[PDB]
Write an enzyme that holds these catalytic residues in place. Structure first.
Site, PDB file in Angstrom:
ATOM      1  CG  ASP D  90      -1.423   1.458   1.525  1.00 61.40           C
ATOM      2  OD1 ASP D  90      -1.735   2.208   0.571  1.00 61.40           O
ATOM      3  OD2 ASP D  90      -1.506   1.832   2.720  1.00 61.40           O
ATOM      4  CE1 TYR D  91      -0.492   7.730  -1.364  1.00 59.31           C
ATOM      5  CE2 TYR D  91      -2.089   6.121  -0.596  1.00 59.31           C
ATOM      6  CZ  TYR D  91      -1.695   7.436  -0.761  1.00 59.31           C
ATOM      7  OH  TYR D  91      -2.507   8.454  -0.322  1.00 59.31           O
ATOM      8  CG  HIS D  92      -0.030   6.065   3.156  1.00 64.26           C
ATOM      9  ND1 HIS D  92       0.807   7.117   3.468  1.00 64.26           N
ATOM     10  CD2 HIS D  92      -1.180   6.626   2.705  1.00 64.26           C
ATOM     11  CE1 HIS D  92       0.198   8.260   3.202  1.00 64.26           C
ATOM     12  NE2 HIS D  92      -1.009   7.989   2.738  1.00 64.26           N
TER      13      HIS D  92
END
Ligand SMILES: [Mg+2]
Ligand SMILES: [Mg+2]
Ligand SMILES: [Mg+2]
Ligand SMILES: [Mg+2]
Ligand SMILES: [Mg+2]
Ligand SMILES: [Mg+2]
Ligand SMILES: [Mg+2]
Ligand SMILES: [Mg+2]
Ligand SMILES: [Mg+2]
Ligand SMILES: [Mg+2]
Ligand SMILES: [Mg+2]
Ligand SMILES: [Mg+2]
Ligand SMILES: [Mg+2]
Ligand SMILES: [Zn+2]
EC number: 3.1.-.-
Lengths: 155, 60, 25, 92, 206, 118
Positions: D90-92
């Site tokens: 997840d881009y986080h």
RNA sequence: CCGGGCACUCUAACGGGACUGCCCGCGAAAGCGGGAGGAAGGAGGGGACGACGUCUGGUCAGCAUGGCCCUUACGGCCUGGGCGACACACGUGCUACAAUGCCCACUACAAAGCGAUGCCACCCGGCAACGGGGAGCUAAUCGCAAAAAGGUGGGCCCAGUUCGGAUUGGGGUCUGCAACCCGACCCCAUGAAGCCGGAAUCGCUAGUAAUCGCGGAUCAGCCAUGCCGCGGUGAAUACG
RNA sequence: CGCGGGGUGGAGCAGCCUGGUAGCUCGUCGGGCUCAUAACCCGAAGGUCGUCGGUUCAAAUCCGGCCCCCGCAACCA
RNA sequence: CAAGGAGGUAAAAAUGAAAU
């Protein structure tokens, strides 16, 4: 931000002497919280003073501290990313602390074998004005001497 | 492996050392107190409920 | 020598007893 | 060609065909991007509109990141016609 | 957030226990499991009564069980069923003195478990939650309460976005020890998930 | 005095001087001089030649020590040469014998760090 | 130890006990400084207690649960392996580099807790781990335990050395169906690196930091030097 | 093809003449600082000296033969 | 005893981060 000026801690007077100073010295000797070994070493060394000289250790120790007292020391202060070193006076509390600290440290710096003989000798040397602690004291006063230029910054 | 695994925990045959503790309220195999027969999680739940006789907050 | 298994001090630290630390008397 | 995996789910999907590491509705999506990262002879080929390709910044420099769906990213390092450290993050 | 269970926070002074028996080891474990299975079995076929408490006391094969209920309508006069084999079915894994009593909780609007349970029913009835919260609080406040507070959290009215609806009138000091604060909780099962209802009821003390 | 393969320890207590031999340590030390009947706290400086002879004769015999038992120890490791076990392979690779942690530590057998970097 | 007594100590149950109430000074008040008052004080020292909310923080592997997916299988049983792999890198630590120190012997002074599907006194074998016996104890009764740092004596004499204990060979014990991969001790022999730490970086303001041992949970056993507690001796300094 | 200078760590440069030591900056690799990158600080590793021969106890160095690179020259008709 | 106006003004310290 030191709202309280932090009151001066007071000690218990020792045995046989009543010093308001010797116990402070025994404390610096003390490592790991063993006052027994600490006190013993000092009183041991007191017995050692009696041998090499016919003087009462209560004065030999007293005068030694008096000779290892920094009149003025160097203090790093303000403006220029704390660039200056103002030579400041030393409070009686701080002269007190430095004297005993430098004594014990210089004492354990000596090449002797027993802790007692180091203490005794370093005290005798310091009483004369010869000790390695006296070196340290005189050194700290050199630094304070060389900075009289911007001493007028004071504070 | 969870349902067939809380089976073995009560089944307990075949060698005595293969038997192990296991929370009853849950199915937890770790931090299981022998005294209650519960995991540390369940034990805390019920202790706050009041359903644990005598069990009380510790302040000292 | 708190980690040497041949001292009363290391035997203390380890907990166990033995020849270098007998079970008293 | 893919050469290394940092994500165990993706790794099993491409190697053995084990889809129990990824989302069930994202099996076809994750497959067709991995194959495109595999047949890729240069990062320029991973430039289709739907992937939203772009190199990362900061401490993640040297890394690339095509988009699978939503806020989910397949991040990797592409060098000499091969991709490495394939991660489904997840881009986080 | 992070706040301690207002029941456990008391336990000693204010708010006594709920299972009051004494045993040493080798017994505590068995008797606690049985005790909890009683609570588990009762909760099932007695929910329609809406039980505020399930007090339990023991004294070597004595097992007393006091069921507090707003309306004990499901007891129906001696041999009119709803008690006979019902208080006797406990001893199918117990075999001890299944002494089952029934209490009449006077005001259900002052019983935290009952309040939260009434709210959690309404969530599953697909009611407007915010309005349901407001009413339940006032309803509790209408029946003489010194302070009240209801909390529903998560997935409000379905809709993909977990929320937290908040309402509280009067006084609810959780930090104070002399509090007499009743705490209740309920799971609302929905076709879109699960949400939790907290209910705080407060009265004076000293 | 050239007791076994060594002679070195002069003025330094025979119970201690003995230790300076691969095969003596500390337990066999006092065990050897109580069985030979010699004062442990002696000078080691070539004292009564007779005590030294008896000591030498007992110690150097009895049990194996010095270069001879070093050879035996090395040969016991050579046992797991042939088509040996798992413990032999640990002597082969240069890794710890007793199955310990090798992810970190184990520097006493691996040696100083080599650093790969990547 | 008995007779007997329970005032001391202790045990644990409720209470009393300071609220700057009293004195001086300052002030409009709040309050602040100082002083006999006492064990104690101007929130006595520590706990439990964590506002509205923030971080699309953490947790579908404690558990509950919407959705998706798997069902001769992504489920189920079993033996074996693996989580313990190692060219390396980082975190938190343990033991040290010694003489306010090490070793051996003797001899003191704790608290908080745990134990009769266990803790195991005292004898016996054994260098020892431990094994044979076997008394007491449902335990402020018996046991785990002698607390350790301390003291007294004696020995090393500053050298990688009686510092340091890694690594390795051999011999054993105990749990366990079994301890090769992967268990803890005991004994013999080896005795390494380290002689005090680069750039950097942490903790603590009074029983505190440092240092010393003791208990417990989990637990057949144990990789615990960990975590949660207990007391022993007990610093330094705060200008700002 | 005629003269002169040059090929040395990944890049750019010294050392050759007065044979026995290959050094400098950048880069790379490890560790720090920062939420992170850059900058900065600490600590490392890294060169068949173009190649084929010869001299010499010993060749980056001195002597030849080739192989590339750069620079000058190629005028009078 | 209560300031209005005039003047010497910090350094070395750049960047952004990966759906609305
Ligand atoms: Mg291993
Ligand atoms: Mg390291
Ligand atoms: Mg409060
Ligand atoms: Mg998140
Ligand atoms: Mg789940
Ligand atoms: Mg692991
Ligand atoms: Mg060395
Ligand atoms: Mg030294
Ligand atoms: Mg503080
Ligand atoms: Mg770097
Ligand atoms: Mg940087
Ligand atoms: Mg012309
Ligand atoms: Mg830029
Ligand atoms: Zn559980």
């Amino acid at each position: 931000a030191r709202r309280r000026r932090a009151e001066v801690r007071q000690l218990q007077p020792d045995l046989v002497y009543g010093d308001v100073l010797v116990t402070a010295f025994i404390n610096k000797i003390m490592r790991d919280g063993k006052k027994n070994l600490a006190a013993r070493i000092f009183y041991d060394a007191c017995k050692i003073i009696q041998e090499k000289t016919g003087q009462e250790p209560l004065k030999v120790f007293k005068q030694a501290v008096e000779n290892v007292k920094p009149r003025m020391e160097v203090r790093s202060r303000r403006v220029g990313g704390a660039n200056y070193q103002v030579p400041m006076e030393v409070s009686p509390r701080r002269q007190q602390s430095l004297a005993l600290r430098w004594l014990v440290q210089a004492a354990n710096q000596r090449p002797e074998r027993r802790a007692a003989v180091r203490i005794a000798h370093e005290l005798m040397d310091a009483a004369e004005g010869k000790g390695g602690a006296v070196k340290k004291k005189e050194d700290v006063e050199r630094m304070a001497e060389a900075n009289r230029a911007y001493a007028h910054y004071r504070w | 492996a969870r349902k067939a695994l809380i089976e073995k925990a009560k089944r307990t045959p075949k060698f005595k050392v293969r038997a192990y503790t296991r929370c009853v309220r849950c199915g937890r195999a770790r931090s299981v107190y022998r005294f209650f027969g519960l995991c540390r999680i369940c034990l805390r739940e019920l202790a706050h409920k009041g359903q644990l006789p005598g069990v009380r907050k510790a302040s000292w | 020598g708190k980690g040497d298994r041949r001292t009363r001090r290391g035997k203390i630290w380890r907990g166990t007893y033995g020849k270098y630390r007998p079970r008293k008397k | 060609g893919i050469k290394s995996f940092k994500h165990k789910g993706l790794k099993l999907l491409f190697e053995k065909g084990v889809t129990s590491g990824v989302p069930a509705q994202d099996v076809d999506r994750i497959n067709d991007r991995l194959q495109a990262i595999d047949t890729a002879t240069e990062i320029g080929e991973l430039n289709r509109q739907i992937y939203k390709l772009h190199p990362l910044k900061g401490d993640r420099e040297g890394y690339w990141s095509i988009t699978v769906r939503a806020n989910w990213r397949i991040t990797f390092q592409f060098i000499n016609g091969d991709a490495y450290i394939l991660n489904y993050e997840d881009y986080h | 957030g992070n706040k301690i269970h207002p029941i456990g926070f008391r336990l000693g002074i204010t708010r006594d226990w709920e299972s009051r028996w004494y045993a040493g080891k080798k017994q505590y474990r068995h008797l606690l499991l049985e005790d909890q299975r009683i609570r588990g079995l009762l909760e099932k076929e007695l929910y329609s009564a809406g039980l505020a408490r399930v007090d339990i006391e023991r004294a070597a094969d004595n097992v007393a069980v006091t069921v507090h209920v707003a309306k004990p309508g499901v007891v129906i006069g001696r041999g009119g069923e709803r008690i006979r084999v019902l208080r006797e079915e406990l001893a199918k894994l117990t075999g001890k003195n299944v002494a089952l009593n029934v209490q009449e909780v006077q005001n259900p609007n002052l019983s935290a478990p009952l309040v939260a349970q009434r709210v959690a029913e309404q969530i599953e009835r697909r009611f407007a939650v915010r309005r349901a919260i407001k009413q339940a609080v006032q309803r509790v406040m209408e029946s003489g309460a010194k302070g009240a507070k209801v909390i529903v959290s998560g997935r409000i009215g379905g809709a993909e976005q977990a929320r937290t609806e908040w309402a509280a009138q009067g006084r609810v000091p959780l930090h104070t020890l002399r509090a007499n604060i009743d705490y209740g909780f309920a799971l609302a099962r929905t076709t879109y998930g699960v949400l939790g209802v907290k209910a705080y009821i407060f009265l004076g003390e000293v | 005095a050239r007791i076994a393969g060594v002679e070195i320890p002069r003025n330094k207590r025979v119970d201690v001087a003995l230790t300076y031999i691969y095969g003596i340590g500390k337990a066999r030390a006092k065990e050897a001089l109580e069985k030979t009947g010699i004062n442990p706290a002696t000078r080691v400086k070539d004292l009564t030649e007779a005590e030294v002879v008896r000591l030498r004769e007992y110690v150097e015999n009895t049990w194996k020590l010095e270069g001879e038992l070093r050879a035996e120890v090395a040969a016991n490791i050579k046992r797991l040469m042939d088509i040996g076990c798992y413990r032999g392979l640990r002597h082969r690779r240069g890794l710890p014998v007793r199955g310990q942690r090798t992810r970190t530590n184990a520097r006493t057998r691996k040696g100083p760090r080599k650093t790969v970097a990547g």
